[PDB]
Design a protein around this ligand. Structure first.
Ligand SMILES: O=C(O)CCCc1ccccc1
Ligand SMILES: [Zn+2]
Ligand SMILES: [Zn+2]
Lengths: 698, 137, 731
């Protein structure tokens, strides 16, 4: 079963390809409608794989140097193996001398495709956390922010280093624990600083005066955080507070850059409002003028966007080059400036959390998921990931889309046509979790092979190497397109195609390219008589691709208006990171129905599903909503009224960005969220127009 | 939305208490003393004056004038509430000694309450007549 | 008394045994009894020369020396609702006006008749005409702004060398002991700044567990890091500043900061005080080397280098003028063990009406004398009265014109002086000339008037008025000469001559002053013949030439000579004379011819001895009153009764090496010498420490450096100096 095949390969190898059978000819590779791509999850969890505590074997060939995998052809008699990528034949290392047939190494077994090694590079560096704190917000927001930061300090490892930077009009770098005096270094939030300047002005396991071990400092930090008071500078009438977000971030970047470069470090920035002074300024300090909107940027009425975006974009590359992670936690009623700061958590593996106030269950709980631990009391996060992909000589890599930065490594696996962050065989992911998913786009220039090698720093400090080796059948020449049409992953393709459209919109029509491929895929793999729209059918392999495209082209990922720019950049941020299942939920929210007549059942995203005597539960990945029809909007009636509330709580915990919960009913203002995701104007109309063009000229 | 605050005895214009911080003061201080000289027992008890980008606000109680200057953009609603807080505190503490003193600024130590009250109005987070001043002068 | 002529070569013992008294102006009996106290106001020539030609013939400098803010025993305070001031020259109504119409008075400085307002009441009995010294209550128009509150900002250097000197401990201790004794009411504000290679502010909020040290490292671009709690209210935040003073000495014990950015630190402290003004105390211990205002090292001279002073930069001069414009005065405390270019650093206090304090080679353990000296000088500095945002103007009768000012201030327009602060220990001098012949009048008057803000927030005016007669005879000008006042005015002139030309020209102008005056006297009359008023003129000028300010062949260092000149420019006449020509008494045999009158105490009055080793004796002990100190020299063959009953020792060998003070033993000999010592330090508000360390072999015999009549290897003796003068007088 092809579905059993897709399921078991994602559970084992954390990957889902657009095609599981690849064009064996040049004549079909060029004519691929949906590019050969893969939804690769480098750190996916699974049923407790054995950590291989020995260094992986490698191929003895300067260029190739792939990892010993089940595809390799072994010879237990001569103690030799032949690399599957370059046919080079290797000798077994001395630790493999007692190799035997009835007891062979772990990597070789087809079950241990996708396996992790633990290597020792000497002393493991301590983890580094750098709190960057805004002080320009209300007291109830600042007091809640302080409690959350004190709670995160109780979870950090005793080995880890911590640093505190608060700001407002000025920027304060705190020198931790200097006993009875409490000092800090004051910098103007009006002019930027480079790392070398910041190094001169400021000055067994290592630690600075500004970055000290948790076990030795946690009591002074938990007190300083408890005494943090709002920015002492007054805010006159009709004015915004002077907030130097752009310089505070750059000082946090330059501090770690000159102290601990090239090591796992997390810059956690907390924002209560937009940057109002300095490089990276997002809006002026006059309350008369509002923060820019999508309408304002389209009519060239937003003089801070490009200059501010460029500032944080250079900061993003500075930190991503050094190998440091930039988190952004923004909670305010107005906009924050996420559009100008989006590149910092996008290029690195940084998080992006957005809410109305730090004094809510929404932010408080979301902030403590960041420090969730596994079956060993260790954070589910990795640092400084290096992703390298080995391909067969027939495959080339166009590029990647997702949280990564190009290491600009050249090799025969690089393709001329580059996509996203392309032109490289190696990418750096400064931060990753068991959820991070990159979209890798391949190109063909019989059993192909792709090997993913991910080196990262673990929460324990251990250096680990994740090696996943997949293999997909080459198409048979006498059955080329028929097998290709059978190995189609309609879900994986819809998101991989969505990845391309969104990346082009965020780096600017996009719907036109999205339709010309929808029509092309309908003509090559659909069934129809020419000039007869009613004859068009699709295989069960393809039937859902049109509907996924309908919702994608109408979603808030591409129709940015009726949303704020920060909301748009926040939606795109999480969609470029999630695996397949969650990404489907975003584009096409799931909808359950609750009534006396039957247990909960999923129903269509159509206006016909909104019944008066029924309770709905829509799962947008960003919000969980419960709807009560006009009838139910009033023990048996209780089982119904709390059946969605019960099912909500479960998923209301797993998901990292805790979805905003909503309880509304017919006539309520919050029912608008259901009516906008529900229901060209209609599918029916969208499908008909698609069929008229599908049976028409190609 | 700034500062200049003076308290003076209406009769002779004798200064009683003031408060000024710069980091000009020289011009609007004269105008403030010109007004204290013109004010008599027929002057309006509550008035507001316009001086271009600046605006004076004063009240008069028990022969004592409470003058404040600020940028015109400062709320005139808040300017009089600031003077009222000063009057009730000043009259309660020194209202019966005013018609007896003769030294200038015999209540400099009222500097303290002026500035701690002044900050409760020049911070949005903390939460009648009109005539051009060039006329009365 | 005496109109008699004196031969300086035959007397050679002309110095009197009792202290010198200022001359009495040859005035009418009723006028002189109202004249100004000579301690506060005096003139080099009590008989003013009628014409400039006569003044030039005398070859003597005409000028005034004043101590206007001196602590008084009794001060009349006029609270008049109106200040009567002459309608022309704005001269205050003084005791030396000429009441004619009984409702009209003639101004004694510009001769205009003024109308006595009907607020002046028997108009000649009003206190403004019965006191030459009097303090007014300034009206509403005598202040540019509401009276500023007392602001004190202390600036400490905390470099590596500074931490080694240990000065920070005792300074923070003195502030803790005298926190309630600082002049000011409930408006007093207090602040603190430390610095090394960076500026360290200190916030003080009652809501925080401890103060906060805000460091600004942008040396080329200083700013204020916080708007509220840097200068805090002392009354409300007494507890907060006491902890910081107890914690400051402990914050830098392990410092490696070898450099000091004094320039930017002073710019930081200025911006903090610019809104209100006040007094800024700066404690520096080494050469400034980092940032703007840095100074280059100089190599110290030796006894061999000739007379070949000025600032090496104008940064501190400019910065002082900026502080002066914001009513900020800077006081410099230099506790340096090496060269620090005080000739440049001193400009921060000369042009802001401050004063510099010098503690050479200060060390908490090694130098116990400088430790106790700083303690007693900080006691005075922290508890003496003070005036804020002050100005002073010196008026003088038409015909007499002031042309040069001496002292720590900033002269704005002519005959005006900006005093960001005014302290009761500052001295000032003025040089004048006869611009118009005084044929008209026979009396001229001088009036100084000090407008200032008190520590209690009250604008006041202190006014002194001096009246003198006019003469037209060369001999009459000589009869009224004040030798001490002439010596003091020449010292201020000689310091300016050094900065303007060289030390050689300064020494020559001093020598030429004695020659040209005594040769002009001789040309109007064998030996060296001088009038009675000038019998101590060459002695005091010789002592001026051996003082550390103008001495040459001595091994003295650079900052010593500069500080010696900063005291000449800023000290009252009395302490200049006490420093230049210290009073030497023999104290091992006191007895009763003393001024007992004081109730239960007897207080011996031993005779003043002249400054020569020929007057000492190995059989006894001698005390020297240098004004600021009281060195007690003990002879080697000293008597046994003085050892056990006064010193508390059994022999000369066991006199402890550094002896910080005498013991108070139960002996009549101790009671006598303690009474004579305490009487000396009661004549002054600056407690002088007394160290008996001056043994016959302590390597601290600078007691002998004050024996200004003996010859040394690089200076003449008093007899040689007389011999040199006579050769030039009748050349
Ligand atoms: O211009 C003036 O002289 C009056 C202001 C300065 C001053 C005041 C009092 C005394 C002397 C001088
Ligand atoms: Zn190989
Ligand atoms: Zn006059």
């Amino acid at each position: 079963t092809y579905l059993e095949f897709i399921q078991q390969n994602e559970e084992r190898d954390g990957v889902r390809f657009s095609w599981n059978v690849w064009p064996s000819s040049r004549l079909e590779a060029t004519r691929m409608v949906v590019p050969v791509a893969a939804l690769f999850t480098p750190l996916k969890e699974r049923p407790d794989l054995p950590p291989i505590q020995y260094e992986p074997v490698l191929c003895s060939r300067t260029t190739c140097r792939a990892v010993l995998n089940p595809l390799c052809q072994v010879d237990y008699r001569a103690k030799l193996w032949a690399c599957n990528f370059c046919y080079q034949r290797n000798q077994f290392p001395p630790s493999y001398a007692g190799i035997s047939e009835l007891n062979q190494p772990a990597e070789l077994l087809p079950q241990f495709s996708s396996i992790e090694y633990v290597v020792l590079r000497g002393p493991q560096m301590p983890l580094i956390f750098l709190y960057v704190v805004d002080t320009c917000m209300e007291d109830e927001d600042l007091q809640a922010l302080k409690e959350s930061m004190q709670m995160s300090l109780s979870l950090l490892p005793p080995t880890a280093l911590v640093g505190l930077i608060t700001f407002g009009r000025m920027v304060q770098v705190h020198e931790l624990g200097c006993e009875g005096i409490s000092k800090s270094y004051v910098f103007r939030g009006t002019k930027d600083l480079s790392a070398k300047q910041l190094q001169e002005m400021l000055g067994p396991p290592p630690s600075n005066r500004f970055l000290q071990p948790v076990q030795k400092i946690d009591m002074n930090l938990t007190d300083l955080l408890g005494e943090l008071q709002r920015d002492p500078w007054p805010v006159p009438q009709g004015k915004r507070p002077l907030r130097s977000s752009g310089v505070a971030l750059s000082i946090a970047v330059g501090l770690l850059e000159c102290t601990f470069p090239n090591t796992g470090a997390r810059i956690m920035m907390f924002i209560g409002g937009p940057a109002t002074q300095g490089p990276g300024m997002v809006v002026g300090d006059e309350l008369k003028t509002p923060i820019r909107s999508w309408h304002d940027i389209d009519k060239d009425n937003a003089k801070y966007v490009k200059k501010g975006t460029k500032h944080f974009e250079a900061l993003a590359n500075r930190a991503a080059t050094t190998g440091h992670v930039i988190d952004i936690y923004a909670c305010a009623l107005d906009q924050t400036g996420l559009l100008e700061m989006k590149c910092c958590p996008n290029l690195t593996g940084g998080y992006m959390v957005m809410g109305d106030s730090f004094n809510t269950s929404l932010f408080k709980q979301t902030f403590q998921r960041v420090f969730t631990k596994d079956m060993h009391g260790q954070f589910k996060m990795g640092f400084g990931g290096t992703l390298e992909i080995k391909t067969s000589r027939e495959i080339k890599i166009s590029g990647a889309i997702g949280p990564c930065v190009s290491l600009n490594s050249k090799g025969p696996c690089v393709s001329e046509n580059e996509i996203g962050t392309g032109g490289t065989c190696q990418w750096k992911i400064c931060g990753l979790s068991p959820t991070t998913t990159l979209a890798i786009y391949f190109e063909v220039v019989g059993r192909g092979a792709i090997q993913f090698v991910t080196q990262y720093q673990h929460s324990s400090g251990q250096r680990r190497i994740r090696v996943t080796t997949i293999a997909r059948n080459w198409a048979d020449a006498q059955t080329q397109i028929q097998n290709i049409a059978a190995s189609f992953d309609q879900e994986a393709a819809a998101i991989l195609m969505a990845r391309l459209a969104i990346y082009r919109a965020e780096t600017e029509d996009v719907l036109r390219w999205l339709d010309r491929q929808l029509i092309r895929l309908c003509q090559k793999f659909g069934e129809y008589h020419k000039d007869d729209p009613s004859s068009f059918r699709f295989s069960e392999t393809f039937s859902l691709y049109p509907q996924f495209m309908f919702h994608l082209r109408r979603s808030s990922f591409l129709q940015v208006f009726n949303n704020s720019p920060d909301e748009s950049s926040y939606y795109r941020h999480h969609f470029m990171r999630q695996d397949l299942t969650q990404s489907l939920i975003m584009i096409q929210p799931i909808l359950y129905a609750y009534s006396f007549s039957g247990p909960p059942e999923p129903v269509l995203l159509d206006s016909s599903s909104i019944l008066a005597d029924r309770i709905l539960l829509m799962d947008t990945f960003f919000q969980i909503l419960i709807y009560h029809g006009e009838t139910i909007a009033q023990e048996n009636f209780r089982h119904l009224l709390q059946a969605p509330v019960d099912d909500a709580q479960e998923i209301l915990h797993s998901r990292f960005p805790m979805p905003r919960y909503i309880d509304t009913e017919h006539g309520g203002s919050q029912a608008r969220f259901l009516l906008s995701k529900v229901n060209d104007v209609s599918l029916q109309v969208f499908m008909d127009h698609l069929k008229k063009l599908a049976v028409s000229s190609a | 939305m700034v500062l200049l605050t003076m308290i003076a005895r209406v009769a002779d214009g004798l200064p009683l208490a003031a408060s000024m911080q710069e980091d000009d003061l020289q011009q609007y201080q004269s105008q403030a003393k010109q007004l204290f000289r013109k004010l008599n027992e027929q002057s309006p008890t509550r008035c507001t004056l316009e001086a271009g980008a600046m605006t004076f606000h004063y009240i008069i109680e028990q022969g004592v004038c409470y003058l404040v200057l600020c940028e015109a953009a400062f709320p005139k609603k808040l300017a009089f509430a600031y003077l009222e807080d000063l009057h009730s505190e000043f009259d309660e503490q020194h209202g019966k000694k005013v018609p007896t003193v003769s030294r200038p600024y015999s209540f400099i130590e009222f500097d303290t309450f002026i500035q701690k009250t002044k900050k409760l109005y020049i911070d949005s987070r903390a939460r009648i007549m009109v005539a051009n001043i060039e006329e009365v002068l | 008394e005496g109109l008699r002529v004196v031969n300086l070569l035959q007397e050679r013992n002309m110095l009197p045994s009792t202290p010198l008294k200022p001359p009495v102006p040859n005035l009418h009996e009723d006028i002189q009894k109202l004249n100004c106290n000579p301690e506060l106001f005096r003139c080099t020539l009590t008989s003013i020369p009628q014409t400039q030609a006569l003044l030039n013939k005398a070859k003597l400098p005409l000028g005034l020396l004043l101590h206007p803010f001196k602590d008084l025993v009794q001060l009349p305070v006029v609270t008049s609702s109106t200040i009567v001031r002459c309608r022309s020259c704005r001269t205050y109504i003084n005791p030396f006006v000429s009441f004619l119409d009984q409702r009209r008075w003639k101004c004694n400085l510009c001769y205009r008749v003024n109308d006595v307002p009907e607020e002046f009441l028997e108009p000649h009995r009003r206190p403004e005409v019965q006191n030459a010294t009097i303090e007014f209550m300034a009206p509403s128009e005598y202040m540019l702004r509401p009276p500023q509150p007392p602001v004190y900002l202390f600036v400490f250097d905390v470099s590596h060398n500074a931490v080694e000197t240990g000065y920070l401990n005792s300074v923070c201790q003195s502030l803790l002991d005298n926190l309630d004794l600082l002049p000011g009411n409930t408006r007093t504000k207090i602040g603190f700044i430390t610095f090394d290679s960076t500026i360290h502010f200190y916030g003080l909020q009652e809501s925080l567990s401890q103060p906060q040290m805000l460091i600004v490292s942008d040396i080329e671009d200083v700013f204020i890091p916080m708007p509220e709690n840097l200068l805090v209210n002392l009354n409300e935040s007494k507890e907060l500043v006491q902890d910081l003073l107890k914690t400051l000495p402990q914050m830098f014990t392990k410092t490696l900061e070898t450099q000091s950015a004094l320039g930017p630190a002073l710019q930081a402290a200025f911006k903090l005080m610019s809104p209100t003004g006040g007094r800024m105390s700066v404690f520096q211990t080494q050469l400034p080397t980092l940032g703007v205002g840095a100074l280059k090292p100089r190599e110290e001279p030796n006894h061999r280098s000739s007379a070949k002073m000025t600032p090496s930069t104008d940064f501190y001069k400019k910065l002082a003028l900026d502080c002066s414009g914001q009513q900020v005065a800077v006081d410099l405390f230099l506790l340096s063990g090496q060269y620090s270019d005080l000739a440049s650093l001193g400009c921060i206090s000369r042009y802001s009406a401050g004063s510099v304090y010098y503690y050479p080679s200060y060390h908490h353990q090694h130098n116990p004398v400088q430790v106790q000296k700083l303690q007693k000088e900080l006691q005075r500095y922290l508890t003496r009265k003070i005036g804020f945002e002050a100005v002073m103007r010196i008026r003088c009768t038409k015909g007499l014109s002031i042309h040069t000012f001496h002292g720590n201030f900033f002269v704005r327009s002519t005959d005006l002086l900006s005093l960001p602060n005014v302290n009761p220990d500052a001295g000032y001098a003025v040089q004048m000339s006869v611009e118009e012949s005084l044929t008209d009048t026979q009396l001229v008057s001088f009036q100084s008037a000090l407008l200032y803000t008190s520590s209690k927030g009250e604008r006041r005016i202190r006014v002194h008025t001096l009246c003198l007669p006019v003469v037209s005879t060369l001999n009459d000008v000589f009869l009224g000469a004040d030798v001490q006042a002439i010596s003091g005015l020449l010292a201020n002139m000689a310091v300016d001559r050094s900065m303007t030309a060289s030390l050689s020209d300064a020494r020559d102008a001093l020598v030429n002053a004695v020659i040209d005056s005594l040769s002009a006297y001789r040309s109007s009359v064998p030996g060296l013949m001088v009038p009675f008023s000038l019998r101590l003129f060459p002695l005091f000028v010789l002592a001026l030439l051996k003082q550390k300010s103008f001495q040459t062949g001595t091994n003295a260092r650079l900052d010593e000579r500069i500080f010696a000149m900063c005291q000449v420019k800023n000290q009252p006449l009395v302490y200049l004379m006490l420093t230049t020509h210290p009073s030497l008494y023999r104290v091992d045999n006191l007895s009763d011819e003393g001024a007992l009158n004081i109730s239960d105490r007897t207080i011996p009055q031993p005779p003043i001895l002249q400054l020569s080793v020929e007057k000492l004796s190995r059989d006894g002990a001698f005390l020297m009153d240098a004004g600021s100190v009281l060195m007690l020299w003990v002879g080697k063959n000293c008597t046994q009764n003085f050892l056990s009953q006064v010193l508390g020792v059994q022999n000369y060998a066991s006199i402890p090496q550094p002896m910080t003070d005498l013991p108070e033993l139960d002996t009549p000999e101790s009671a006598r010498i303690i009474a004579f010592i305490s009487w000396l330090r009661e004549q002054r508000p600056f407690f002088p420490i007394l160290y008996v360390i001056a043994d016959e072999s302590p390597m601290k015999a600078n007691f002998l450096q004050n024996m200004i009549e003996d010859r040394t290897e690089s200076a003449l003796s008093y007899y040689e100096f007389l011999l040199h003068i006579q050769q030039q007088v009748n050349k």
